[PDB]
Scaffold this active site. Sequence first.
Site, short mmCIF file in Angstrom:
data_model
loop_
_atom_site.label_atom_id
_atom_site.label_comp_id
_atom_site.label_asym_id
_atom_site.label_seq_id
_atom_site.Cartn_x
_atom_site.Cartn_y
_atom_site.Cartn_z
N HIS A 26 14.05 14.15 11.81
CA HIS A 26 12.76 14.19 12.77
C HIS A 26 12.10 12.96 12.69
O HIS A 26 11.25 12.63 13.33
CB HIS A 26 12.10 15.28 12.28
CG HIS A 26 11.42 15.23 11.01
ND1 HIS A 26 10.15 14.35 10.70
CD2 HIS A 26 11.50 16.07 9.96
CE1 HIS A 26 9.90 14.62 9.57
NE2 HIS A 26 10.67 15.53 8.96
N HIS A 27 12.51 12.09 11.80
CA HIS A 27 11.97 10.72 11.57
C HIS A 27 12.62 9.91 12.46
O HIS A 27 12.30 8.34 12.53
CB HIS A 27 11.97 10.18 10.34
CG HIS A 27 10.73 10.83 9.35
ND1 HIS A 27 9.84 10.21 9.27
CD2 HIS A 27 11.00 11.84 8.40
CE1 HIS A 27 9.05 11.09 8.47
NE2 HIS A 27 9.66 11.91 7.92
N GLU B 189 11.31 13.38 -0.41
CA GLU B 189 10.55 12.80 -0.98
C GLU B 189 9.08 13.31 -0.71
O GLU B 189 8.22 13.54 -1.45
CB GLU B 189 10.24 11.29 -0.81
CG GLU B 189 9.13 10.43 -1.61
CD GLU B 189 9.38 10.54 -2.93
OE1 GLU B 189 10.59 10.95 -3.50
OE2 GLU B 189 8.49 10.05 -3.63
N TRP C 72 7.02 0.19 4.31
CA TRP C 72 7.37 0.74 3.13
C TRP C 72 9.02 1.57 3.40
O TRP C 72 9.51 1.80 2.40
CB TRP C 72 6.67 1.66 2.77
CG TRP C 72 6.74 3.40 3.23
CD1 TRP C 72 6.14 3.55 4.50
CD2 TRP C 72 7.27 4.19 2.70
NE1 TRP C 72 6.36 5.09 4.48
CE2 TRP C 72 7.38 5.27 3.60
CE3 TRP C 72 8.05 4.50 1.68
CZ2 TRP C 72 7.61 6.71 3.46
CZ3 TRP C 72 8.71 5.68 1.28
CH2 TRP C 72 8.54 6.81 2.31
N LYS D 95 3.13 30.71 1.76
CA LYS D 95 2.09 30.37 0.66
C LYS D 95 0.74 30.13 0.95
O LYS D 95 -0.07 30.60 0.01
CB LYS D 95 2.60 28.96 0.00
CG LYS D 95 4.16 29.20 -0.34
CD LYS D 95 4.55 27.84 -1.51
CE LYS D 95 4.21 28.31 -2.97
NZ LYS D 95 2.98 28.50 -3.03
N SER E 173 13.65 6.04 -13.61
CA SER E 173 12.66 6.74 -14.40
C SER E 173 12.50 8.30 -13.65
O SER E 173 12.38 8.99 -14.48
CB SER E 173 11.19 6.05 -14.39
OG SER E 173 10.88 5.79 -12.96
N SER E 174 12.61 8.42 -12.46
CA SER E 174 12.39 9.25 -11.87
C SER E 174 13.58 10.41 -12.10
O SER E 174 13.57 11.84 -12.37
CB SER E 174 12.15 9.41 -10.28
OG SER E 174 13.43 8.81 -9.75
N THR F 90 6.09 27.76 4.43
CA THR F 90 4.83 27.02 4.33
C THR F 90 3.55 27.95 4.44
O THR F 90 2.58 27.90 3.77
CB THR F 90 4.76 25.70 4.78
OG1 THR F 90 5.93 24.89 4.43
CG2 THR F 90 3.61 25.01 4.43
N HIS G 212 12.43 12.49 3.41
CA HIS G 212 11.56 13.58 3.71
C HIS G 212 11.63 14.36 2.61
O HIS G 212 10.64 14.92 2.03
CB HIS G 212 12.12 14.50 4.82
CG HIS G 212 11.39 15.62 5.36
ND1 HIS G 212 10.26 15.58 5.98
CD2 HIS G 212 11.48 17.09 4.87
CE1 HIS G 212 9.64 16.54 5.91
NE2 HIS G 212 10.37 17.50 5.64
N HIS H 124 0.81 -1.04 0.14
CA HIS H 124 0.01 -0.07 0.05
C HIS H 124 0.95 1.54 -0.07
O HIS H 124 0.79 2.01 -0.89
CB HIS H 124 -0.90 0.08 1.24
CG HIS H 124 -1.68 1.11 1.27
ND1 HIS H 124 -2.72 1.56 0.15
CD2 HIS H 124 -1.94 2.08 2.39
CE1 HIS H 124 -3.34 2.63 0.69
NE2 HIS H 124 -3.10 2.94 1.74
N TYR I 280 8.34 16.25 0.29
CA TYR I 280 8.11 17.58 -0.60
C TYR I 280 8.33 17.45 -2.20
O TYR I 280 7.66 18.37 -2.79
CB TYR I 280 9.10 18.60 -0.13
CG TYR I 280 8.97 18.93 1.41
CD1 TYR I 280 7.86 19.81 1.58
CD2 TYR I 280 9.58 18.55 2.45
CE1 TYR I 280 7.70 20.16 3.23
CE2 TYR I 280 9.50 18.85 3.67
CZ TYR I 280 8.46 19.42 4.05
OH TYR I 280 8.18 19.88 5.40
N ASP J 194 7.51 20.99 -27.84
CA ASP J 194 7.39 19.81 -27.11
C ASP J 194 8.48 19.62 -26.12
O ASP J 194 9.19 20.69 -26.03
CB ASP J 194 7.62 18.61 -28.30
CG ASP J 194 9.02 18.86 -28.94
OD1 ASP J 194 9.49 19.65 -28.89
OD2 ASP J 194 9.12 17.78 -29.55
N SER K 37 -1.71 27.05 -6.78
CA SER K 37 -1.59 28.46 -7.62
C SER K 37 -2.18 28.79 -8.86
O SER K 37 -3.04 29.70 -8.89
CB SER K 37 -0.11 28.78 -7.57
OG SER K 37 0.42 28.08 -8.53
N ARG L 287 1.06 1.69 15.16
CA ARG L 287 1.07 1.62 13.71
C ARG L 287 1.61 0.08 13.34
O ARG L 287 1.81 -0.73 14.13
CB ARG L 287 1.92 2.56 12.76
CG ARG L 287 1.47 4.00 13.19
CD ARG L 287 2.60 4.90 12.53
NE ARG L 287 2.89 4.31 11.01
CZ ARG L 287 3.74 4.91 10.19
NH1 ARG L 287 4.14 6.12 10.54
NH2 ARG L 287 3.96 4.40 9.01
#
Lengths: 47, 49, 459, 107, 121, 65, 50
Positions: C277-278, C230, C125, C306, C152-153, C303, C228, C60, C232, C90, C243, C428
């Site tokens: 912080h993790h 990731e 995960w 915005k 790919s990323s 943050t 982390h 998941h 963001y 293109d 926006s 969890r």
Amino acid sequence: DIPWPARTDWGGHDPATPFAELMINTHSMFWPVAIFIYVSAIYMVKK
Amino acid sequence: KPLKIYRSRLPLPYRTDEEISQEKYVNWCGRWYSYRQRLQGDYYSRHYF
Amino acid sequence: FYILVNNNKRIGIYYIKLSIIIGILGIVLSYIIRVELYNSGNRIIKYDNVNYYNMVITLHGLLMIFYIIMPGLYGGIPLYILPILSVITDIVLPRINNISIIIVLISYIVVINSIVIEYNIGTGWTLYPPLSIIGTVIVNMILYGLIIIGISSIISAINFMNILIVIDGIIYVYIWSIIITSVLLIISLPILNGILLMILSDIYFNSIYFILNGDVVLYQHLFWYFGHPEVYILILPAFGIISIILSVLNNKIIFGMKSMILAIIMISILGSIVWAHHIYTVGLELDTKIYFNNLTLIISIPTGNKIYNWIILYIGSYNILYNGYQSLIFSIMFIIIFIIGGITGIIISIDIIDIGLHDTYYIVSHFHYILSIGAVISLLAGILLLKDIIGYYNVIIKINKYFGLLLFININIIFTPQFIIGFNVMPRRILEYSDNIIVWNLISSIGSISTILILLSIF
Amino acid sequence: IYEGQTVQESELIPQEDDWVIEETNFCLGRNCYVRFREEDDLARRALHQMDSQLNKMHTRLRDGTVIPYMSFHPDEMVDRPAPIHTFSEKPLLKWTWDETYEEAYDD
Amino acid sequence: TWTEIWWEHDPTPKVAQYRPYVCTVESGKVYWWCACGESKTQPWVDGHCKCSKREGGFRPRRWEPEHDGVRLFCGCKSCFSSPTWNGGCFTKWMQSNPAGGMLYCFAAAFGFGTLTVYRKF
Amino acid sequence: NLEDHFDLAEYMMKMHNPMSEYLYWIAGFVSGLHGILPLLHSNYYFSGMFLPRDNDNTQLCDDSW
Amino acid sequence: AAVRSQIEAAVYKWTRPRPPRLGVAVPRSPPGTGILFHTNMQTIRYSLSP
Ligand SMILES: CCCCCCCCCCCCCCCCCC(=O)OC[C@H](COP(=O)([O-])OCC(O)COP(=O)([O-])OC[C@@H](COC(=O)CCCCCCCCCCCCCCCCC)OC(=O)CCCCCCCCCCCCCCCCC)OC(=O)CCCCCCCCCCCCCCCCC
Ligand code: HEA
Ligand code: HEA
Ligand SMILES: [O-][O-]
Ligand SMILES: [Cu+2]
Ligand SMILES: [K+]
Ligand SMILES: [Zn+2]
Ligand SMILES: [Zn+2]
């Protein structure tokens, strides 16, 4: 000590150490600030 | 020497003589729209803030 | 042709199509989890098959993060509009764009095939060792998928960076959002690859990094140094969409464009330096904990700027325009929902509060409110805005107030109770739990079945 | 910050005492799903779609100039749905400055 | 106060009522709302007010409901959501009677304070 | 050509064969089955039943059914 | 009721707004210029005086 049914326990419950009391009060201290941040921002979500 | 472009040779988009006589009026409307826009900005900024 | 096409807009459609397909598998796994957690006992998973639950939660998470939301918000909408926003014919790298989507599909097939053929076990995960390195071959297959996805990323990130060389107009905020995510990927992915290779070395090459005298906490540093950034990389494209929608639908020019842009840059730099912080409960040094806690709280500043700049975009807009369009509602709902997720993030950022709330369902609800609600709704809102340009039909979404209301209500029924059980406390990554936590778990489960039913009404 | 174009009082003075603000409707019209004819084939349905583009519409003012469909971003400038090849002729972003050179003028 | 102190080139309505008009409306029917406050068939244009005669910048305001039902309509003629009511009638009244406005606001705030404090405490 | 102007012209002009849509939905349906079928198979493999009976891993009353 | 009207009339007189100190560089309206716009313009919110 043990979880009890349908309890919010917002910030924690039944501390049995001085550190446990500290944790509960740290959350309680910041909670009103969080409410202020939310209410103040949401009130302006409108045309 | 650089190549020269003559604006007098450009075909123009079609506009009737009646329409051509209203150019000053349309410019006048545009200025009043900009005046009303600018004033409203101050008014709204004060109200919402 | 279908597979040979290099058109950047066609490939963008492929990314959205594949995200929905893979998303079906993701949602199904979520339904399994919530069904199981409806009461105490075994409901749909045997006690002798508890390893399957561990695999369900692991897949998941991995699928929704890397195969659904990331391909949808960083591959789908970006590949379709970015070259148009840049007033360029293109995408800069046509052939690379084609292989990227094919790579994503091939890595998905590997993962699902590993479900069918390999023994089903799970390690989260986050693939923490030593548990990840003492497992069966399914872990090896998942590692191959992640590494392939990483290829790919990175190549897609290279593709977007090249737009700076060809952009013929102005770099709009959305373009800035993608560029910064691309930078975050170029800097974070190479570190992830290294640590993943070390997981493989211990699994497959008799390496000893994650056995005594080797520090297992090392993995968590390198993993979360990507982890982390990731989160963001997954949210910043959503911000860019929000926006555009607010400015377009309200007919209002973006306010503080440069502050929006500089807020995105700031979030990236800060997001690259707050990963630990993790790792608050591992036992790091006092000064390290204080540094990371301090810098984590700083991220709220950019943050927050915005969020308030978005609010003034909606304020003052003309009343005559109909405000019930689904895209506008979703964009507004994002502000309301993201604030909830972020504020709870600041709560967990305090390490002493975190001791109580680490590895509890409060963390779950926190990142669900941002991703499962905020990111999903942002992707939906973006696709909805581009309905005319994309051209899809045979759905009733564009003007459907019932869908928006039902989704908002029921999604909150699922995750709001998960904040409560975080102070109960319910850990969890568990399936069985004490009988005094059934009420809240039951309420959330009722919310999950209901949300699924609402997904059928769109057709 | 942008606060509109600057106006001098001289430019707000009318040439007639009856001048008011022109009441031209900027609602383009009533629309819905583009409705294709059954008789039309794929080629003729493409022509139909190209003739229903809102971004090709405008409003003509009293002096014959037209205010076009405008957007903040160029995403709304391509045909809907997006064709395979969109910006064949490079879209031109017009910048304004006060610089001039003598060659452009004639006495 | 935009028409009163800021801008003198927009038409200024007369307040017909500092309270909304309640009316039953039907989907698929078009209604015309009085924007001058001088119509005798409030909240609708009567054919004899400024709006009907297109006088002094006053024009009827077109409106159409999506569904059948009872809808509130603006009597003060200045509500932001005109023709529909959103509370601007009360706001405009406070501008005209600021002493009364304070009384109502105090009473409303007093009730809100008591209830929220009583429940949370 | 006019037919080639729009990407996926048949679908956009509403002439596409419905089978394409059916395949897309079928593909999604198969993807969903990858979470349910191995659940049933694994349950039977380690227990002998495809799905449990609620609370059958705990002590039950005599009349429980 | 007499005192009520007295304080109501006292508050009202004091609150009547004075012209705004524009924080924007706008022109002066030409002299003798009346209403030029119409009521179909996008509604401008009615705001209380400070
Ligand atoms: C999250 C969900 C909810 C979301 C809600 C919100 C959604 C918001 C809106 C989102 C919109 C996104 C953007 C949309 C853009 C659309 C553009 C578009 O339409 O492009 C045109 C594109 C193609 O149109 P075209 O241009 O006419 O293409 C012509 C072809 O290229 C050429 O035509 P052709 O006829 O020559 O085609 C070749 C054809 C030839 O086809 C045939 O000959 C077919 C013959 C019939 C076969 C039927 C299936 C049979 C299955 C049998 C199973 C038996 C099981 C037995 C079990 C026994 C147990 C005891 O195919 C092939 O040869 C290859 C097919 C490969 C693909 C299918 C794969 C199926 C699964 C396979 C699994 C395999 C697992 C193996 C495991 C092995 C393990 C060892 O459209 C599509 O591909 C269809 C798209 C349809 C949906 C569009 C979106 C609509 C809006 C959303 C609706 C909700 C969807 C929810 C997800 C699905 C839920 C299930
Ligand atoms: C896109 C998804 C996303 C986003 C945006 C965030 C954003 C944030 N997250 Fe994250 N987080 C996750 C996804 C996300 N997170 C996931 C998936 C996990 C768990 C992974 C796992 O453990 O397996 C996680 C875990 C996680 C933890 C771990 C808790 C634990 O392990 O016990 C913490 C604590 O530091 C944290 C903090 C934060 C903070 C401080 C922010 C900030 O970005 C929030 C900033 C936003 C606001 C603060 C609100 C808006 C700003 C304002 C309204 C201004 C005013 C506010 C203030 C002045 C405070 N997150
Ligand atoms: C973005 C990623 C994402 C998304 C969408 C979701 C969505 C959901 N998740 Fe999430 N979840 C995670 C990421 C995500 N989750 C992660 C990373 C974990 C931790 C993994 C771990 O513990 O190891 C987790 C863990 C997790 C658990 C904890 C199990 C455990 O470890 O004990 C639970 C159940 O309580 C759960 C439930 C749900 C539910 C009920 C939904 C949703 O079904 C709610 C309803 C919403 C929808 C059904 C809409 C979703 C639609 C799409 C995603 C498609 C969008 C596509 C387009 C718009 C084109 N999730
Ligand atoms: O992760 O925040
Ligand atoms: Cu983090
Ligand atoms: K259970
Ligand atoms: Zn009238
Ligand atoms: Zn009113």
